Amino acid sequence: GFELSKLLQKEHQMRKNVIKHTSARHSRFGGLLSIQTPDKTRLTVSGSQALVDEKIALQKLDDSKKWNKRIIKKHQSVAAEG
Amino acid sequence: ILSMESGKVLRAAIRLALDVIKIDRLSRTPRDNMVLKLVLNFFRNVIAIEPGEFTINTKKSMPKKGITSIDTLPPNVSMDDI
Amino acid sequence: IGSKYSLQFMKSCIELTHSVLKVLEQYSDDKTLVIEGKSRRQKKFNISEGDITKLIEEENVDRDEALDILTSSLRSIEVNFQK
Amino acid sequence: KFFSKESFLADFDDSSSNED
Amino acid sequence: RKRRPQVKLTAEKLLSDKGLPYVLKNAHKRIRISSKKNSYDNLSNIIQFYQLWAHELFPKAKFKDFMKICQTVGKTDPVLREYRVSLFRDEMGM
DNA sequence: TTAAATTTTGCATACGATCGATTAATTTTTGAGTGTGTTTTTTTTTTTTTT
DNA sequence: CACACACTCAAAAATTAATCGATCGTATGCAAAATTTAA
C-alpha cells in the first residue's frame, strides 16, 4: 500500500499535467485561433486550450498533419532463431 | 504437471533419480547416469515451457481492422498457471 | 553499430560503455596500462643467450618459456585514456 | 556450505513420514 | 502514366529566399537565450522559430520528420554541402 | 689531434581508418480501379371483442 | 437508375542498408650526420 500510494500520487501528477491540456468546455464549443509569424501570414487552429498559450497551439499545428515518415524496423529476427 | 495435486510427478521424478543415487559411484552404469540426465531434462522441460508467439502472414496488406489480439493461450490455461 | 538494433541492445551498450569508462578512468593517474597488443609488421629480434641466461637468473625461469616471455614483451604496448 | 546427499535422503524419508 | 512526383526536401528548396538565407537573415534577431528564463522556455523558444520556419518551408512533414529529412539531405546533396562550406568560408574571411 | 662506431633525427612511403559517393532491395503508399448499398414506411379507418 | 462508401491492389519511388573509392592519419624503413670514444 505504501508503493501503491506513491504510484497513485505519480498518476495524479501525470493526470493533472494531462488535464492542463484538456479543454474546460465540451468538444463542440468551437474556438478558432489565427496565429501570425512576424512574416505576415494567417494560420488557423481549432481549440479552446490552444487559444491562450502558444506552445499548445504549435503542438496542434504539428499534430494536425497526417503525413508520417517511414521508420524502418529490424522486424525482431531474434525470434526466428530457436 | 504443475497443478495436479501440487505436482506429485516432480516427487516421482526425484524418486526415479534417487533410485540411481542410492547406488555407489563405482557401481553406477552409464544408463543410470542417463536416467539422471532424463530427470534433469524433465525439470528443464517443466521450467522452460513458455507461451508461444503470434505469427502473421505479411504477403497480403494489413486491413483497416488490424491486429485485434496476440493471445496464444489455451481455454483452461491462464497466465498465472504458466 | 548500436542504433540500428533494439532497445535492450542499446541499453546494454549504455551499461557496457559506462563500465568501460569507469574501469578505465581509475588508471588515469596510476598510468598502469600495459596491454598485449597485436603487432602488424616485422617484430623479429636476434636473441642473445647471455641476456636469456641473466633473465633466467633474474626471474627463475626456463629458457623456453623465457623465449616466450621475450616474445611477449615485444608486443606489449601502452594505451592512453584520453585516446 | 556443502549439501549432503544422505541428508537429502533422510529429509525425503522424514517428510514422507510426517511432512511437518 | 506519370502524373506527378511527390515533393521532397530538395536542393532548390533550401537555396530559395524562404529557407537558409531566411535563417541567416533572422535567426539572430529571433532567437533569444536568457539565463533568467528557465530551460523549458529557452528550449521552446529555440524550437518555435525553427518550427515556424519548417511550416513555412516544408509543411507536409512533421517537425521531427523534418529534422530527419534535413539530416538525410545534408548527408546527400552536394550543393547544400558547398553552400555550408561557403557560409563558413565567408565568415572566416571577414 | 683525427678517424671510426653509434644512435638520433628528418624525410619518404605504403598501409589501414574512416567518411563519402553510389546503388540495389523493399515495402509502404497511391490513390486507381472496382464491388456494392441505397426512398421509406405512417397515421388513419374498420371490425371485433370485452368492458 | 448514379452516387457515394468501402475493399483490394500493380507500380512508383523515398528510404535505408550495403559496397567500393578517395583521402587522410600513422607507423616504419632509409639516408645522412652530429656526437662520443679510441689510438
Side-chain angles (χ1 to χ4, degrees):
Chain A
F2 208 76
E3 202 177 358
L4 184 62
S5 294
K6 263 62 151 193
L7 276 162
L8 276 296
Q9 293 179 356
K10 174 203 221 173
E11 280 265 35
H12 195 296
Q13 292 192 326
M14 176 172 68
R15 174 171 71 231
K16 164 194 58 179
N17 282 353
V18 160
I19 67 171
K20 163 73 176 141
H21 292 217
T22 309
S23 167
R25 298 257 177 226
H26 65 279
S27 67
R28 300 313 213 280
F29 207 101
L32 261 54
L33 183 63
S34 281
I35 60 170
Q36 70 280 347
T37 78
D39 186 74
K40 278 298 303 172
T41 177
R42 296 302 277 281
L43 293 175
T44 66
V45 297
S46 175
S48 177
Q49 163 74 340
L51 269 193
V52 188
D53 186 74
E54 297 193 12
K55 275 179 251 214
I56 297 89
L58 290 164
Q59 189 173 1
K60 183 92 171 43
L61 184 80
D62 204 2
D63 290 358
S64 179
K65 307 168 187 174
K66 52 182 60 54
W67 157 255
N68 272 16
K69 195 180 182 293
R70 180 76 190 99
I71 297 89
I72 194 55
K73 191 55 68 185
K74 199 63 60 175
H75 314 306
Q76 282 75 239
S77 306
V78 192
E81 288 85 34
Chain B
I1 282 177
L2 294 175
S3 308
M4 181 145 188
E5 69 201 39
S6 75
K8 210 79 171 180
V9 59
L10 315 169
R11 261 169 73 86
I14 70 177
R15 182 168 291 281
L16 281 164
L18 321 173
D19 283 2
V20 166
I21 290 180
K22 280 171 186 174
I23 318 168
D24 300 331
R25 195 175 49 80
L26 302 182
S27 295
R28 271 193 283 243
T29 53
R31 195 153 307 280
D32 306 308
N33 294 353
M34 185 63 72
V35 165
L36 266 176
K37 192 167 107 173
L38 168 82
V39 176
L40 274 295
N41 276 2
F42 173 59
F43 281 157
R44 103 178 175 79
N45 296 296
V46 168
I47 298 169
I49 285 302
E50 65 183 1
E53 65 183 1
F54 204 90
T55 57
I56 62 170
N57 206 298
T58 180
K59 202 197 54 62
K60 273 281 281 213
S61 288
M62 173 169 324
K64 310 175 182 299
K65 293 182 183 292
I67 301 168
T68 187
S69 73
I70 62 170
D71 175 84
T72 307
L73 285 185
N76 299 349
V77 187
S78 51
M79 271 315 317
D80 168 59
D81 306 358
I82 310 184
Chain C
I1 57 154
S3 70
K4 328 190 304 294
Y5 305 125
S6 74
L7 172 65
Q8 289 87 29
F9 199 97
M10 281 180 31
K11 196 170 71 69
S12 288
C13 277
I14 301 298
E15 296 216 319
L16 181 57
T17 309
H18 180 95
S19 290
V20 159
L21 294 188
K22 189 181 182 301
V23 75
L24 276 188
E25 80 172 39
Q26 293 311 297
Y27 280 171
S28 179
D29 183 62
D30 266 352
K31 95 172 78 174
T32 54
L33 294 174
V34 298
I35 278 177
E36 300 215 290
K38 287 299 178 58
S39 299
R40 269 199 56 244
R41 285 169 80 167
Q42 162 172 355
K43 245 65 181 187
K44 184 222 171 293
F45 170 58
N46 287 299
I47 59 171
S48 306
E49 62 205 79
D51 195 15
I52 283 177
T53 45
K54 68 182 181 179
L55 263 67
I56 283 172
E57 280 324 297
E58 276 146 23
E59 67 269 14
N60 304 357
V61 67
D62 182 50
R63 55 160 211 281
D64 293 299
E65 46 198 8
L67 282 168
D68 201 357
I69 285 307
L70 187 153
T71 51
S72 297
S73 177
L74 296 175
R75 280 83 66 193
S76 171
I77 62 170
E78 210 176 299
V79 65
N80 189 359
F81 177 63
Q82 321 279 351
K83 175 33 52 183
Chain D
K1 200 174 291 181
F2 168 67
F3 283 86
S4 306
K5 63 94 176 179
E6 71 86 10
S7 291
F8 178 55
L9 272 295
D11 265 346
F12 200 50
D13 216 349
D14 189 75
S15 306
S16 82
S17 68
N18 53 21
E19 198 200 300
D20 207 58
Chain E
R1 195 204 199 279
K2 306 300 175 58
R3 282 194 201 147
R4 73 280 188 191
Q6 83 293 30
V7 295
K8 56 192 161 323
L9 192 64
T10 56
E12 283 265 329
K13 195 172 290 294
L14 276 299
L15 270 298
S16 175
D17 317 302
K18 300 176 288 294
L20 292 178
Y22 184 26
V23 178
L24 277 296
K25 279 190 33 173
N26 278 3
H28 52 78
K29 291 180 67 175
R30 202 89 39 87
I31 282 300
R32 284 184 213 202
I33 309 187
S34 81
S35 181
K36 298 295 184 289
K37 287 180 177 177
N38 54 352
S39 179
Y40 180 27
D41 189 359
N42 261 338
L43 281 153
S44 66
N45 172 222
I46 298 298
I47 301 299
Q48 183 212 32
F49 159 72
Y50 283 114
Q51 184 178 2
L52 293 175
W53 176 76
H55 207 253
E56 182 47 10
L57 183 63
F58 198 87
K60 195 184 69 83
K62 291 185 184 295
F63 186 64
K64 298 179 184 180
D65 304 325
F66 183 74
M67 298 332 274
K68 294 270 194 172
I69 62 170
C70 294
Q71 291 254 340
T72 308
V73 166
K75 290 165 161 293
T76 310
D77 179 67
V79 187
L80 183 63
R81 298 156 69 119
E82 52 86 30
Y83 182 76
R84 279 182 53 223
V85 310
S86 76
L87 294 174
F88 289 136
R89 205 187 295 126
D90 281 328
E91 60 76 16
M92 52 205 308
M94 181 255 288

PDB file of all heavy atoms in Angstrom, chain C residues 4 40-43 83, chain G residues 17-18 26-29:
ATOM      1  N   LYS C   4      20.997   0.801 -34.862  1.00  0.00           N
ATOM      2  CA  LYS C   4      20.135   0.050 -35.761  1.00  0.00           C
ATOM      3  C   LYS C   4      19.291  -0.983 -35.023  1.00  0.00           C
ATOM      4  O   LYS C   4      18.175  -1.287 -35.458  1.00  0.00           O
ATOM      5  CB  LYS C   4      20.986  -0.628 -36.833  1.00  0.00           C
ATOM      6  CG  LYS C   4      22.231   0.168 -37.199  1.00  0.00           C
ATOM      7  CD  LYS C   4      22.924  -0.399 -38.424  1.00  0.00           C
ATOM      8  CE  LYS C   4      23.277  -1.863 -38.232  1.00  0.00           C
ATOM      9  NZ  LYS C   4      24.296  -2.039 -37.162  1.00  0.00           N
ATOM     10  N   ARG C  40      51.903  -5.716 -36.275  1.00  0.00           N
ATOM     11  CA  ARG C  40      51.492  -5.895 -37.660  1.00  0.00           C
ATOM     12  C   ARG C  40      52.662  -6.224 -38.577  1.00  0.00           C
ATOM     13  O   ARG C  40      52.642  -7.246 -39.269  1.00  0.00           O
ATOM     14  CB  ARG C  40      50.779  -4.626 -38.144  1.00  0.00           C
ATOM     15  CG  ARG C  40      49.274  -4.630 -37.952  1.00  0.00           C
ATOM     16  CD  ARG C  40      48.613  -3.591 -38.847  1.00  0.00           C
ATOM     17  NE  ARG C  40      48.950  -3.771 -40.255  1.00  0.00           N
ATOM     18  CZ  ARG C  40      49.630  -2.894 -40.982  1.00  0.00           C
ATOM     19  NH1 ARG C  40      50.079  -1.764 -40.460  1.00  0.00           N
ATOM     20  NH2 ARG C  40      49.870  -3.160 -42.262  1.00  0.00           N
ATOM     21  N   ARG C  41      53.685  -5.381 -38.601  1.00  0.00           N
ATOM     22  CA  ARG C  41      54.858  -5.607 -39.431  1.00  0.00           C
ATOM     23  C   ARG C  41      55.899  -6.379 -38.618  1.00  0.00           C
ATOM     24  O   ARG C  41      55.570  -6.981 -37.591  1.00  0.00           O
ATOM     25  CB  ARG C  41      55.366  -4.276 -39.989  1.00  0.00           C
ATOM     26  CG  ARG C  41      54.501  -3.740 -41.120  1.00  0.00           C
ATOM     27  CD  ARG C  41      54.857  -2.313 -41.477  1.00  0.00           C
ATOM     28  NE  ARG C  41      56.035  -2.243 -42.333  1.00  0.00           N
ATOM     29  CZ  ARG C  41      56.414  -1.161 -42.997  1.00  0.00           C
ATOM     30  NH1 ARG C  41      55.732  -0.029 -42.924  1.00  0.00           N
ATOM     31  NH2 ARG C  41      57.506  -1.213 -43.754  1.00  0.00           N
ATOM     32  N   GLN C  42      57.146  -6.400 -39.092  1.00  0.00           N
ATOM     33  CA  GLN C  42      58.190  -7.239 -38.512  1.00  0.00           C
ATOM     34  C   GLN C  42      58.546  -6.802 -37.095  1.00  0.00           C
ATOM     35  O   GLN C  42      58.876  -5.635 -36.854  1.00  0.00           O
ATOM     36  CB  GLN C  42      59.429  -7.202 -39.406  1.00  0.00           C
ATOM     37  CG  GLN C  42      60.708  -7.672 -38.731  1.00  0.00           C
ATOM     38  CD  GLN C  42      61.861  -7.806 -39.702  1.00  0.00           C
ATOM     39  OE1 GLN C  42      61.691  -7.643 -40.910  1.00  0.00           O
ATOM     40  NE2 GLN C  42      63.043  -8.107 -39.179  1.00  0.00           N
ATOM     41  N   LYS C  43      58.462  -7.748 -36.158  1.00  0.00           N
ATOM     42  CA  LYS C  43      58.897  -7.558 -34.780  1.00  0.00           C
ATOM     43  C   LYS C  43      60.006  -8.537 -34.411  1.00  0.00           C
ATOM     44  O   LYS C  43      60.216  -8.816 -33.226  1.00  0.00           O
ATOM     45  CB  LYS C  43      57.715  -7.707 -33.819  1.00  0.00           C
ATOM     46  CG  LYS C  43      57.343  -6.438 -33.069  1.00  0.00           C
ATOM     47  CD  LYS C  43      56.845  -5.355 -34.013  1.00  0.00           C
ATOM     48  CE  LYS C  43      56.503  -4.082 -33.256  1.00  0.00           C
ATOM     49  NZ  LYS C  43      55.853  -3.071 -34.132  1.00  0.00           N
ATOM     50  N   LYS C  83      42.992   9.012 -25.325  1.00  0.00           N
ATOM     51  CA  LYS C  83      42.781   8.402 -26.634  1.00  0.00           C
ATOM     52  C   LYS C  83      41.540   7.513 -26.626  1.00  0.00           C
ATOM     53  O   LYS C  83      40.797   7.476 -27.612  1.00  0.00           O
ATOM     54  CB  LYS C  83      44.038   7.612 -27.034  1.00  0.00           C
ATOM     55  CG  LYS C  83      44.078   6.739 -28.337  1.00  0.00           C
ATOM     56  CD  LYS C  83      43.300   7.145 -29.621  1.00  0.00           C
ATOM     57  CE  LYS C  83      43.546   8.575 -30.122  1.00  0.00           C
ATOM     58  NZ  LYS C  83      42.707   8.890 -31.310  1.00  0.00           N
TER      59      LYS C  83
ATOM     60  P    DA G  17      19.122   1.404 -42.035  1.00  0.00           P
ATOM     61  OP1  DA G  17      18.257   1.151 -40.860  1.00  0.00           O
ATOM     62  OP2  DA G  17      20.062   2.547 -42.023  1.00  0.00           O
ATOM     63  O5'  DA G  17      19.963   0.082 -42.358  1.00  0.00           O
ATOM     64  C5'  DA G  17      19.296  -1.079 -42.841  1.00  0.00           C
ATOM     65  C4'  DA G  17      20.068  -1.724 -43.982  1.00  0.00           C
ATOM     66  O4'  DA G  17      20.043  -0.861 -45.150  1.00  0.00           O
ATOM     67  C3'  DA G  17      21.541  -2.017 -43.693  1.00  0.00           C
ATOM     68  O3'  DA G  17      21.865  -3.319 -44.161  1.00  0.00           O
ATOM     69  C2'  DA G  17      22.281  -0.930 -44.476  1.00  0.00           C
ATOM     70  C1'  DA G  17      21.350  -0.694 -45.655  1.00  0.00           C
ATOM     71  N9   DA G  17      21.448   0.653 -46.207  1.00  0.00           N
ATOM     72  C8   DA G  17      21.325   1.824 -45.519  1.00  0.00           C
ATOM     73  N7   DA G  17      21.440   2.895 -46.264  1.00  0.00           N
ATOM     74  C5   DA G  17      21.662   2.395 -47.533  1.00  0.00           C
ATOM     75  C6   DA G  17      21.871   3.022 -48.776  1.00  0.00           C
ATOM     76  N6   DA G  17      21.891   4.351 -48.934  1.00  0.00           N
ATOM     77  N1   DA G  17      22.063   2.231 -49.854  1.00  0.00           N
ATOM     78  C2   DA G  17      22.042   0.900 -49.694  1.00  0.00           C
ATOM     79  N3   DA G  17      21.855   0.196 -48.575  1.00  0.00           N
ATOM     80  C4   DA G  17      21.668   1.011 -47.521  1.00  0.00           C
ATOM     81  P    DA G  18      23.242  -4.030 -43.730  1.00  0.00           P
ATOM     82  OP1  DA G  18      22.900  -5.409 -43.318  1.00  0.00           O
ATOM     83  OP2  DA G  18      23.973  -3.155 -42.787  1.00  0.00           O
ATOM     84  O5'  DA G  18      24.059  -4.105 -45.102  1.00  0.00           O
ATOM     85  C5'  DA G  18      23.460  -4.717 -46.236  1.00  0.00           C
ATOM     86  C4'  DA G  18      24.214  -4.383 -47.512  1.00  0.00           C
ATOM     87  O4'  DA G  18      23.992  -2.996 -47.876  1.00  0.00           O
ATOM     88  C3'  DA G  18      25.731  -4.576 -47.450  1.00  0.00           C
ATOM     89  O3'  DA G  18      26.157  -5.279 -48.607  1.00  0.00           O
ATOM     90  C2'  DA G  18      26.267  -3.141 -47.429  1.00  0.00           C
ATOM     91  C1'  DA G  18      25.219  -2.415 -48.251  1.00  0.00           C
ATOM     92  N9   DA G  18      25.140  -0.979 -47.984  1.00  0.00           N
ATOM     93  C8   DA G  18      24.867  -0.381 -46.787  1.00  0.00           C
ATOM     94  N7   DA G  18      24.840   0.929 -46.842  1.00  0.00           N
ATOM     95  C5   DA G  18      25.111   1.211 -48.170  1.00  0.00           C
ATOM     96  C6   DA G  18      25.223   2.425 -48.881  1.00  0.00           C
ATOM     97  N6   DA G  18      25.071   3.624 -48.313  1.00  0.00           N
ATOM     98  N1   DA G  18      25.501   2.356 -50.202  1.00  0.00           N
ATOM     99  C2   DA G  18      25.653   1.152 -50.768  1.00  0.00           C
ATOM    100  N3   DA G  18      25.570  -0.056 -50.204  1.00  0.00           N
ATOM    101  C4   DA G  18      25.294   0.046 -48.892  1.00  0.00           C
ATOM    102  P    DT G  26      47.446  10.709 -36.277  1.00  0.00           P
ATOM    103  OP1  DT G  26      46.874  10.588 -34.919  1.00  0.00           O
ATOM    104  OP2  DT G  26      48.298  11.876 -36.602  1.00  0.00           O
ATOM    105  O5'  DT G  26      48.261   9.375 -36.603  1.00  0.00           O
ATOM    106  C5'  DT G  26      47.557   8.150 -36.774  1.00  0.00           C
ATOM    107  C4'  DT G  26      48.494   7.036 -37.204  1.00  0.00           C
ATOM    108  O4'  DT G  26      48.691   7.085 -38.642  1.00  0.00           O
ATOM    109  C3'  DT G  26      49.891   7.089 -36.580  1.00  0.00           C
ATOM    110  O3'  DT G  26      50.268   5.795 -36.146  1.00  0.00           O
ATOM    111  C2'  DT G  26      50.771   7.568 -37.733  1.00  0.00           C
ATOM    112  C1'  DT G  26      50.063   6.942 -38.919  1.00  0.00           C
ATOM    113  N1   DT G  26      50.356   7.612 -40.211  1.00  0.00           N
ATOM    114  C2   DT G  26      50.663   6.846 -41.309  1.00  0.00           C
ATOM    115  O2   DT G  26      50.708   5.629 -41.282  1.00  0.00           O
ATOM    116  N3   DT G  26      50.916   7.558 -42.450  1.00  0.00           N
ATOM    117  C4   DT G  26      50.894   8.933 -42.598  1.00  0.00           C
ATOM    118  O4   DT G  26      51.137   9.482 -43.667  1.00  0.00           O
ATOM    119  C5   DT G  26      50.567   9.677 -41.406  1.00  0.00           C
ATOM    120  C7   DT G  26      50.512  11.175 -41.443  1.00  0.00           C
ATOM    121  C6   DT G  26      50.318   8.988 -40.283  1.00  0.00           C
ATOM    122  P    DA G  27      51.184   5.614 -34.839  1.00  0.00           P
ATOM    123  OP1  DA G  27      50.306   5.161 -33.736  1.00  0.00           O
ATOM    124  OP2  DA G  27      51.992   6.843 -34.678  1.00  0.00           O
ATOM    125  O5'  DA G  27      52.171   4.423 -35.237  1.00  0.00           O
ATOM    126  C5'  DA G  27      51.634   3.182 -35.673  1.00  0.00           C
ATOM    127  C4'  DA G  27      52.535   2.532 -36.709  1.00  0.00           C
ATOM    128  O4'  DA G  27      52.617   3.373 -37.888  1.00  0.00           O
ATOM    129  C3'  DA G  27      53.971   2.275 -36.259  1.00  0.00           C
ATOM    130  O3'  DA G  27      54.358   0.969 -36.652  1.00  0.00           O
ATOM    131  C2'  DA G  27      54.777   3.355 -36.987  1.00  0.00           C
ATOM    132  C1'  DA G  27      53.966   3.565 -38.254  1.00  0.00           C
ATOM    133  N9   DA G  27      54.086   4.909 -38.808  1.00  0.00           N
ATOM    134  C8   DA G  27      53.901   6.086 -38.142  1.00  0.00           C
ATOM    135  N7   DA G  27      54.057   7.151 -38.892  1.00  0.00           N
ATOM    136  C5   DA G  27      54.360   6.637 -40.140  1.00  0.00           C
ATOM    137  C6   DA G  27      54.639   7.249 -41.377  1.00  0.00           C
ATOM    138  N6   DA G  27      54.656   8.574 -41.553  1.00  0.00           N
ATOM    139  N1   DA G  27      54.902   6.444 -42.431  1.00  0.00           N
ATOM    140  C2   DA G  27      54.885   5.116 -42.253  1.00  0.00           C
ATOM    141  N3   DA G  27      54.636   4.426 -41.138  1.00  0.00           N
ATOM    142  C4   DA G  27      54.379   5.253 -40.110  1.00  0.00           C
ATOM    143  P    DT G  28      55.664   0.272 -36.031  1.00  0.00           P
ATOM    144  OP1  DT G  28      55.266  -1.089 -35.606  1.00  0.00           O
ATOM    145  OP2  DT G  28      56.288   1.185 -35.047  1.00  0.00           O
ATOM    146  O5'  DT G  28      56.636   0.147 -37.289  1.00  0.00           O
ATOM    147  C5'  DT G  28      56.098  -0.246 -38.544  1.00  0.00           C
ATOM    148  C4'  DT G  28      57.044   0.094 -39.679  1.00  0.00           C
ATOM    149  O4'  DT G  28      56.869   1.480 -40.085  1.00  0.00           O
ATOM    150  C3'  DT G  28      58.534  -0.073 -39.367  1.00  0.00           C
ATOM    151  O3'  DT G  28      59.167  -0.742 -40.447  1.00  0.00           O
ATOM    152  C2'  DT G  28      59.015   1.372 -39.250  1.00  0.00           C
ATOM    153  C1'  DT G  28      58.142   2.035 -40.296  1.00  0.00           C
ATOM    154  N1   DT G  28      58.062   3.523 -40.176  1.00  0.00           N
ATOM    155  C2   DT G  28      58.290   4.299 -41.292  1.00  0.00           C
ATOM    156  O2   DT G  28      58.551   3.834 -42.386  1.00  0.00           O
ATOM    157  N3   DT G  28      58.199   5.647 -41.079  1.00  0.00           N
ATOM    158  C4   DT G  28      57.911   6.286 -39.885  1.00  0.00           C
ATOM    159  O4   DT G  28      57.851   7.506 -39.792  1.00  0.00           O
ATOM    160  C5   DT G  28      57.687   5.415 -38.757  1.00  0.00           C
ATOM    161  C7   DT G  28      57.369   5.996 -37.410  1.00  0.00           C
ATOM    162  C6   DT G  28      57.773   4.091 -38.953  1.00  0.00           C
ATOM    163  P    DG G  29      60.506  -1.601 -40.218  1.00  0.00           P
ATOM    164  OP1  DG G  29      60.131  -3.030 -40.302  1.00  0.00           O
ATOM    165  OP2  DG G  29      61.198  -1.097 -39.011  1.00  0.00           O
ATOM    166  O5'  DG G  29      61.400  -1.235 -41.492  1.00  0.00           O
ATOM    167  C5'  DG G  29      60.854  -1.374 -42.800  1.00  0.00           C
ATOM    168  C4'  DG G  29      61.506  -0.409 -43.775  1.00  0.00           C
ATOM    169  O4'  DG G  29      61.098   0.951 -43.474  1.00  0.00           O
ATOM    170  C3'  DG G  29      63.034  -0.413 -43.779  1.00  0.00           C
ATOM    171  O3'  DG G  29      63.504  -0.434 -45.119  1.00  0.00           O
ATOM    172  C2'  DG G  29      63.401   0.891 -43.066  1.00  0.00           C
ATOM    173  C1'  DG G  29      62.230   1.794 -43.420  1.00  0.00           C
ATOM    174  N9   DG G  29      61.966   2.823 -42.419  1.00  0.00           N
ATOM    175  C8   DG G  29      61.652   2.614 -41.102  1.00  0.00           C
ATOM    176  N7   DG G  29      61.453   3.712 -40.431  1.00  0.00           N
ATOM    177  C5   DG G  29      61.650   4.720 -41.363  1.00  0.00           C
ATOM    178  C6   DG G  29      61.568   6.121 -41.209  1.00  0.00           C
ATOM    179  O6   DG G  29      61.300   6.761 -40.184  1.00  0.00           O
ATOM    180  N1   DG G  29      61.837   6.787 -42.401  1.00  0.00           N
ATOM    181  C2   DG G  29      62.148   6.174 -43.593  1.00  0.00           C
ATOM    182  N2   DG G  29      62.375   6.983 -44.639  1.00  0.00           N
ATOM    183  N3   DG G  29      62.223   4.855 -43.752  1.00  0.00           N
ATOM    184  C4   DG G  29      61.959   4.193 -42.598  1.00  0.00           C
TER     185       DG G  29
END
